Ligand binder design. Structure first.
Ligand SMILES: [Mg+2]
Ligand SMILES: [Zn+2]
Ligand SMILES: [Zn+2]
Lengths: 49, 84, 140, 147, 133, 263, 436, 61, 66, 113, 49, 97
RNA sequence: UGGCCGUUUUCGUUGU
């Protein structure tokens, strides 16, 4: 999730980025207002503890 | 005063679609609530159909009162209006 | 392990093959990038398998490298509204809304990754014989 | 599995539908128009590989970024005795007269969706009205009226 | 009852795109400058280059709903191997003597050139075209 | 005028050759025997009690598909028309199943064979479930485990494949003609040429390929239909064919009766 | 409710007044509404799950008004662009295209059927285009049977002659097709099409009937002929692949040399743009041009039997770029008008070395979908698709807002009898609406 | 009317022998709801079977 | 869940053959073979027995409420 | 929830006769038949033969909508024969053709095994 | 609730193709036609109906 | 000559330039310098260019009505809450928007 | 013996 809200559309937060290579799914995201916000970790992602 | 004499009437003599619809609905209602029919009925039991036919024969006793922008009005007869 | 920041300064080989320079000219297969801007290469890491970059709802799609990406995204979207068998013990669980397909069947065309997603063990769709043809004009 | 979403317009008994040379009939019929505009090549490749797997009796490997190409699938399908591109002559059902075109025909993985029709059907003649406004309530479940 | 007649040679045959239908450019034998361009169905009446043909253009066939042809009735066509009913969509009053007549057989068009004396009587609505053998 | 030439006969599958009949007729025969062959199948499933992990509707459905020997169904009247109050043994064949498992280990497997005929308008050979063999257990209806009991009181009736696909006696009708496309009714897609891509039909040797110089026949028609029938076993393929022909005949006869009676 | 009664009908959003109409009732089973496949465009609807709403008059005057004012026939031509709004779409269109090809022939019994399907048919068969040796009809005759009496038209495409060897161009006389491949350009919603003329000439009622008649006929013929698509439609001969591959190599070489020059401060500076911007614009033009060239090569390769080409020509779906991308090359992937940024340190993806400007290195998808993309190119394609999605999502709401504001602004302006256009107060904005 | 909310079958008609429940009994045309389908059908009073103390009793209960 | 009764496409009853298919698989015969010996030629049937998933054993693995 | 009865696709209501004829007054010796509970299975067969006859000018039918079980047949025989006779003649012809086919198949199956 | 409001005598549903219907006609499930209704004054022309 | 930057009054007096045709893309300066009617025409031209750039087309009368309402009072009645509400029409009207 | 009463407000998820 992203705590950027929706008051003011903009496009930098929603769009994809190069660094995402191999960490989030380039294919999955919902449709409508959340499109681009809600992401999903890639199939080999790992979170530092 | 607000009326204008039939000698000097200036509005178009064709019957506009809105006038057609309003007269048809009004007559069909009246027809459908025990009003007399000014033309023959043979098979068209539908009051709207009766109204359509009666208009086609120019046998409808209704006067349009068109309001000019100022507030004056003029009186056209459904009889005289040229139905296309 | 490596993160985005650490990735910032590492050169990777797309596959183990690239680790050795290659030497043909098929008319019906993909072509590798030219990669000619650095006549000398000194690799330091090699990807496990490129297909790993996808997500869970995305690995269900067969041949995702053969589609217009928005279609991939759409398919990912409805993948979560597909009737099927969510959990073996549906009988004992007693929830508000739950649906079960009588005769689920695994997809004839699997992606290798679906082994670990158990999809072939819990499918949510059938293999149906469909004819792509204007038959009587009701399918427009 | 490729976004070619759609509904069911009408259903046909077994006889009226077209059948191939072997007596098969298809489960479902979709619109060709939908494919070219959307460029869902994976859909066609999946249908081909599914046909190959069914005849050869095993599941196909469709992992992206591999050496598989439509060439190999065509070769296998031909060797197994079918058109190397998956076309199959079909016959009309209302008469049996052949179909001047050659239909594409095979098993594809579908999956039903949650939006059954009856969940959305609705009507309203008269019913509950908001006390505050003397206006009909909102929502299908409560006999609501549309805006 | 025939409004015209001549014998035509087949100069060139072209198929191009189509398969069941092909275009032929023919020139008359009796009178040059009568150039014929017609489109015919290969399967329904095959031909080839360098052929010769007998062409007729008769207003009617008697010697409105159609019916399958009874074998009892007789018609002018009985002695020809390809018939096409048509209509004239343009009757050109062309140059000094380059008069052109345009007939469409429901998609198959026919452009004809010839002397006004030759085409004077083809100013009509619907025309049959008959080809011998 | 009509001819017949059976190529391979059997209990279930018939692979024949029908020629010298209007293609309309062959197609209509195929349709009618796919759709309009009266048969017998489970209709009303009355469940006294159940303890399986399968929904009651799920079993009632599974029973709906069980093929019933209907070799004498032609004698059985329509339950819609029969005058008896409720059902009778002359308009309904009652079958009951009551199976159970006991013990804490293993899994029982209730098969179609466990079905039993209680009554039926005997000795009409109707009601019995079909089997490939005697020892062939057959169709699998469910699996039972410790303490799980299944009891049902089935009913069958005489309906037609129109009203549902359980009344279909036909499984898969092959059908074709002109294996070399002499009549050309199909245009062949290709990338290089029609002949070096499309593999030949199995009836390839049954009609000689057109000669290279052969030219089109505009009076040609479809003449030889090769239709290979198959059945689930609920009725013998020959019975299927004869019954379809009889049904179509009586239907046309009804139509002609209507025509004459109208005046 | 009984059949033939009048009731409203609607979709949301109701952008333009062609999103509401007054239809007639037909009672039927099942629990869905059904629309003639033509009227989808005015509702901008499709059956991928869309929904509609309904309303019913409760009085006769209202029934009269609905009948006389909001019936579908009167809505056929759009006062927005003075042209027909509905049109023959999808199967009917893509079919009637083939039915009217010159070399399609129909035997007698099929014609017996089709001529009876046309409800308004006169009941008098037309004589065939062949009376010997075999009575045959051409589709054009039948399609014409649909068109009512007293109809005229004409059109010249590509400057063809009145002979039309290309078989383009359209000439109708008394409502009988004289020749021409009937398709969108003739029956589409566009201006000057058959529908426009039928409307203007015979009134609305006949124009409505025309859609149903043509639909029935072409649907029936397609049924008894049928149409489909298959994977082979997306493949071409190896020679065309060699051509396109060498074209791609040439384009890549051109970009290589362009970079070599721009490196050396020898590349001319475009006025109004800097070195980098002009450099990018030039390379983008080069790559787009190479893609278009390869696409045109693959297109000219296609045979007329190929279904994709049949649809494209018919035009009921698809376009040239679709073919170019499926078969020839996806091409270049563009983001906010610029190539793929160097999100990493001096490169797009960590796999390439630093400072690579070559097409693939900044988002040139070399292969076509049929060949399948390589990983990096797949990722770039994903970026592009996400961008398009975001753009649509943003644009829809803003357009809705602007439309709302406008509608509120002008909501009161109406046309009085005097011929002057006044708002509520009586201000006069135009003395004669639109000046005519 | 004491003849409501009782299990009822159909002895004659296109649904011969289907268990149904009397949902509405306005008059002379009983509205009965079945079990196998998800629907309710009208039916004349004399075309039904009414459960009684013993056996199935026609319209005399 | 359980092997269906009738093939959806054609109608050729298959459910009874499931056990035999498992049996043939046991001794290591390749799947295409096993499907052959059952006399399943039309792949409209081959699709099922090749790609049906048995769940009823899983659903029974839970002790019934009885 | 509004699906038709699947037993109604073939069963006929009492008040509606199985077949209904309508003379086609706009041309001579033409009739239009309003069938009931029938589809391509019967219509195609009747039409093929009635077309094969010599004294039939026009014959055709159409399936209004697959959601309804009835179709309409147009028939127009020459003045020589009234259409009713032509239709019943075709009926008899198919009846006898089917009988012949049945007999031949019976004999063939007897000999085959 | 003034510019717009929830209204009566309405109905909503899915839509589907129908090549065999007129242009100005629309499939209307039976249940809705049974639900909605339209007042009809009593005249001599419809008393029986 | 095309330029970036708008100065309408000053440039027309620059020698070497046709001062009877020069046009600017900011119709506000059109109102400021070349009066109102020129403003109307420039506004219409700009709207037409914007809509038609893609390839679309709209009946002229509609855009004419839009512009001629926009400048009926003589000054740019920019379509927002301000301009619409600043109109002296009935309160019920301007309130709802 | 007619006559006859089922929340709001949030937030979420989705759908076109
Ligand atoms: Mg949609
Ligand atoms: Zn009985
Ligand atoms: Zn099967």
């Amino acid at each position: 999730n992203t705590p950027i809200g929706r008051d003011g559309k903009l496009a930098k937060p929603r769009q994809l980025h190069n660094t995402h290579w191999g960490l989030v799914c380039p294919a999955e995201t919902p449709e409508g207002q959340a499109c681009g916000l809600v992401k999903n970790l890639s199939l080999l992602s790992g979170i530092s503890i | 005063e607000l009326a204008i004499l039939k000698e000097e009437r200036t509005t178009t003599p064709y019957l506009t679609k809105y006038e057609r619809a309003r007269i048809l609905g009004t007559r069909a209602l009246q027809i459908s609530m025990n009003a007399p029919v000014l033309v023959d009925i043979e098979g068209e039991t539908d009051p709207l159909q009766i109204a359509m036919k009666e208009l086609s024969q120019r046998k409808i006793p209704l006067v349009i009162r068109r309001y000019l922008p100022d507030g004056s009005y003029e009186d056209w007869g459904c009889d005289e209006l040229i139905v296309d | 392990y490596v993160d985005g920041e650490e990735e910032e300064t590492i050169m990777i080989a797309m596959t183990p093959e690239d680790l050795q320079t290659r030497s043909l000219n098929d008319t019906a297969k993909r072509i590798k990038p030219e990669m000619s801007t650095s006549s000398h290469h000194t690799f330091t890491h090699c990807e496990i398998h490129p297909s790993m970059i996808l997500g869970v709802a995305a690995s269900i799609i067969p041949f995702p490298d053969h589609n217009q990406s928005p279609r991939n995204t759409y398919q990912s979207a409805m993948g979560k509204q597909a009737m099927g068998v969510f959990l073996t013990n549906y009988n004992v669980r007693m929830d508000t809304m739950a649906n079960i397909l009588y005769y689920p069947q695994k997809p004839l065309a699997k992606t290798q990754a679906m082994e670990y997603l158990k999809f072939r063990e819990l499918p949510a769709g059938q293999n149906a014989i469909v004819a792509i043809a204007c038959y009587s004009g009701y399918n427009q | 599995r490729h976004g070619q979403k759609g509904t069911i317009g009408v259903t046909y008994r077994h006889e009226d539908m077209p059948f191939s040379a072997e007596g098969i009939v298809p489960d479902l019929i979709i619109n060709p128009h939908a494919i070219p505009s959307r460029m869902t090549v994976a859909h066609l490749i999946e249908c081909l590989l599914s046909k190959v797997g069914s005849i050869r009796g095993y599941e196909g490997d469709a992992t992206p970024f591999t050496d598989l190409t439509v060439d190999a699938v065509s070769n296998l399908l031909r060797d197994n005795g079918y058109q190397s591109r998956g076309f199959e002559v079909m016959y009309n059902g209302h008469t049996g007269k052949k179909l001047m075109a050659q239909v594409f025909f095979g098993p594809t993985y579908y999956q039903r969706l949650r939006h059954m029709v009856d969940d959305k059907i609705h009507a309203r003649a008269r019913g509950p009205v908001q006390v505050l406004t003397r206006q009909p309530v909102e929502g299908r479940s409560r006999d609501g009226g549309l805006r | 009852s025939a409004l015209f007649d001549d014998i035509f040679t087949v100069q060139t045959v072209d198929n191009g795109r189509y398969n069941k239908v092909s275009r032929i450019i023919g020139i008359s034998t009796t009178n040059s400058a009568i150039k014929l361009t017609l489109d015919i169905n290969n399967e329904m009446f095959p031909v080839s280059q360098d052929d010769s043909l007998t062409v007729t253009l008769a207003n009617s066939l008697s010697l409105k709903s159609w019916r399958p042809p009874k074998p009892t009735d007789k018609s002018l066509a009985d002695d020809y191997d390809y018939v096409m009913f048509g209509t004239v969509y343009k009757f050109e009053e062309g140059d000094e003597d380059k008069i052109k007549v345009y007939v469409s057989f429901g998609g198959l068009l026919m452009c004809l050139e010839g002397g006004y004396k030759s085409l004077a009587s083809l100013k009509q609505d619907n025309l049959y075209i008959l080809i011998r053998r | 005028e009509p001819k017949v030439n059976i190529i391979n006969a059997q209990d279930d599958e018939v692979e024949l050759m029908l020629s010298d009949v209007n293609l309309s007729l062959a197609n209509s025969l195929r349709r009618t025997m796919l759709a309009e062959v009266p048969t017998l199948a489970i209709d009303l499933v009355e469940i006294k009690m159940n303890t399986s992990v399968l929904a009651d509707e799920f079993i009632s459905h599974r029973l709906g598909l069980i093929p019933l020997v209907s070799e004498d169904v032609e004698e059985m009247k329509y339950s819609r028309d029969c005058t008896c109050e409720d059902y009778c043994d002359e308009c309904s064949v009652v079958l009951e199943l009551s199976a159970r498992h006991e013990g804490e280990e293993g899994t029982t497997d209730v098969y179609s064979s466990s079905l039993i005929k209680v009554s039926g308008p005997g000795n009409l050979n109707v009601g019995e479930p079909v089997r490939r063999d005697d020892y062939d257990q057959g169709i699998l209806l469910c699996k039972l485990r410790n303490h799980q009991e299944l009891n049902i009181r089935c009913i069958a009736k005489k309906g037609i494949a129109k009203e549902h696909a359980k009344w279909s006696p036909c499984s898969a009708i092959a059908f074709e003609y002109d294996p070399h496309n002499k009549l050309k009714h199909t245009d062949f897609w290709f990338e290089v040429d029609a002949k070096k891509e499309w593999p030949d039909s199995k009836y390839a040797t049954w009609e000689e390929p057109p000669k290279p110089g052969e030219v089109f026949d505009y009076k040609a028609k479809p003449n030889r239909f090769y239709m290979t029938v198959e059945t689930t076993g609920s009725l013998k393929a020959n019975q299927v064919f004869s019954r379809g022909i009889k049904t179509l005949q009586e239907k046309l006869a009804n139509v002609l009766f209507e025509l004459e009676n109208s005046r | 409710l009984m059949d033939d009664d009048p009731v409203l009908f609607n979709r949301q959003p109701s952008l333009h007044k062609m999103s509401m109409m007054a239809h007639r009732v037909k009672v039927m089973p099942y629990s869905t509404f059904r629309l003639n496949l033509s009227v989808t465009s005015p509702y901008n609807a499709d059956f991928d799950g869309d929904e509609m709403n309904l309303h019913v008059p409760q009085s006769e005057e209202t029934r009269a008004e609905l009948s006389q004012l909001c019936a579908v026939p009167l809505q056929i031509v759009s006062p927005q662009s003075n042209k027909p709004v509905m049109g023959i779409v999808q199967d009917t269109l893509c079919g009637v295209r083939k039915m009217t090809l010159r070399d399609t022939f129909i035997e007698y019994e099929q014609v017996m059927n089709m001529l009876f399907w046309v409800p308004s048919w006169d009941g008098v068969v037309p004589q065939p285009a062949i009376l010997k040796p075999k009575p045959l009809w051409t589709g054009k005759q039948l399609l014409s049977i649909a068109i009512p009496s007293g109809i005229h038209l004409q059109r010249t495409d590509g400057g063809n002659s009145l002979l039309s060897p290309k078989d383009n161009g359209m000439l109708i006389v008394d409502g009988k097709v004289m020749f021409g491949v009937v398709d969108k350009k003739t029956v589409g919603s566009g201006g000057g099409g058959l529908i426009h003329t039928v409307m203007r000439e015979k009134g609305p009622k006949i124009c409505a009937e025309l859609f149903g008649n043509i639909q029935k006929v072409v649907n029936y013929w397609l049924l008894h002929n049928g149409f489909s698509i298959g994977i082979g439609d997306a493949i071409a001969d190896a020679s065309t692949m060699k051509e396109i591959t060498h074209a791609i190599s040439s384009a890549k070489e051109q970009v290589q040399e362009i970079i070599y020059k721009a490196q050396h401060n020898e590349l001319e500076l475009k006025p109004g743009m800097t070195l980098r911007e002009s450099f990018e614009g030039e390379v983008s033009r080069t790559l787009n041009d190479a893609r278009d060239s390869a696409g045109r090569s693959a297109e000219m390769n296609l045979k007329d039997l190929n279904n994709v080409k049949q649809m494209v020509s018919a035009g009921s779906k698809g376009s040239f770029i679709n073919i170019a991308q499926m078969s020839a090359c996806v091409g270049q992937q563009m983001v906010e008008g610029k190539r793929i940024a160097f999100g990493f340190a001096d490169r797009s993806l960590p796999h390439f070395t630093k400072d690579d400007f070559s097409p693939e290195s900044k988002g040139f998808v070399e292969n076509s979908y049929l060949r399948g993309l390589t990983p990096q190119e797949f990722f770039f394609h994903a970026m592009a698709g996400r961008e398009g999605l975001i753009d649509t999502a943003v644009k829809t709401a803003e357009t809705g807002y602007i439309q709302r504001r406008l509608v509120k602004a002008l909501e009161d302006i109406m046309v009085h009898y005097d011929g002057t256009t006044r708002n509520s107060l009586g201000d006069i904005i135009q003395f004669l609406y639109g000046e005519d | 009317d004491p003849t409501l909310n009782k299990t009822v079958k159909i002895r004659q008609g296109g649904y011969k022998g289907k268990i149904g429940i009397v949902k509405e009994a306005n008059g002379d045309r009983f509205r009965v709801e079945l079990h196998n389908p998800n629907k309710t059908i009208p039916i004349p009073c004399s075309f039904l079977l009414i459960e009684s103390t013993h056996g199935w009793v026609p319209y005399e209960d | 869940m359980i092997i269906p009764v009738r093939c959806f496409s054609c109608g050729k009853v298959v459910g009874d053959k499931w056990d035999a298919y498992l049996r043939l698989l046991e001794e290591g015969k390749q799947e295409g073979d096993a499907l052959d010996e059952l006399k399943l030629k039309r792949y409209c049937c081959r699709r099922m027995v090749l790609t049906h998933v048995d769940l009823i054993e899983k659903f029974l693995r839970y002790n019934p409420l009885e | 929830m509004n699906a038709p009865d699947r037993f109604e696709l073939f069963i006929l209501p009492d008040d509606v006769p199985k077949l209904k004829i309508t003379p086609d007054s706009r041309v001579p010796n033409c009739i239009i038949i309003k069938f009931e509970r029938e589809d391509h299975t019967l219509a195609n067969l009747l039409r093929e033969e009635l077309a094969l006859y010599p004294d039939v000018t026009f014959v055709a039918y159409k399936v209004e909508h697959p959601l309804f079980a009835n179709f309409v047949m147009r028939l127009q025989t020459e003045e020589g024969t009234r259409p009713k006779q032509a239709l019943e003649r075709a009926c008899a012809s198919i009846i006898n053709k089917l009988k012949t086919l049945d007999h031949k198949f019976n004999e063939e199956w007897n000999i085959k095994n | 609730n003034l510019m717009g409001k929830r209204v009566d005598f309405s109905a909503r549903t899915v839509i589907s193709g129908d090549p065999n219907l007129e242009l100005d006609q629309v499939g209307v499930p039976i249940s809705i036609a049974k639900t909605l209704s339209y007042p009809e004054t009593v005249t001599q022309y419809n008393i029986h109906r | 000559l095309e330029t970036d930057g708008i100065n309408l009054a000053e440039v027309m007096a620059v020698p070497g330039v046709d001062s009877s045709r020069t046009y600017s893309n900011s119709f506000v300066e059109i109102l400021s310098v070349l009066g109102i009617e020129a403003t109307r025409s420039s506004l219409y031209k700009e709207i037409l260019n914007v809509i038609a750039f893609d390839g679309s087309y709209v009946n002229y009368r509609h855009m004419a009505l839009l512009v001629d309402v926009m400048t009926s009072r003589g000054y740019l009645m920019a379509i927002t809450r301000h301009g619409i509400n600043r109109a002296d029409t009935g309160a019920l009207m301007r309130c709802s928007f």
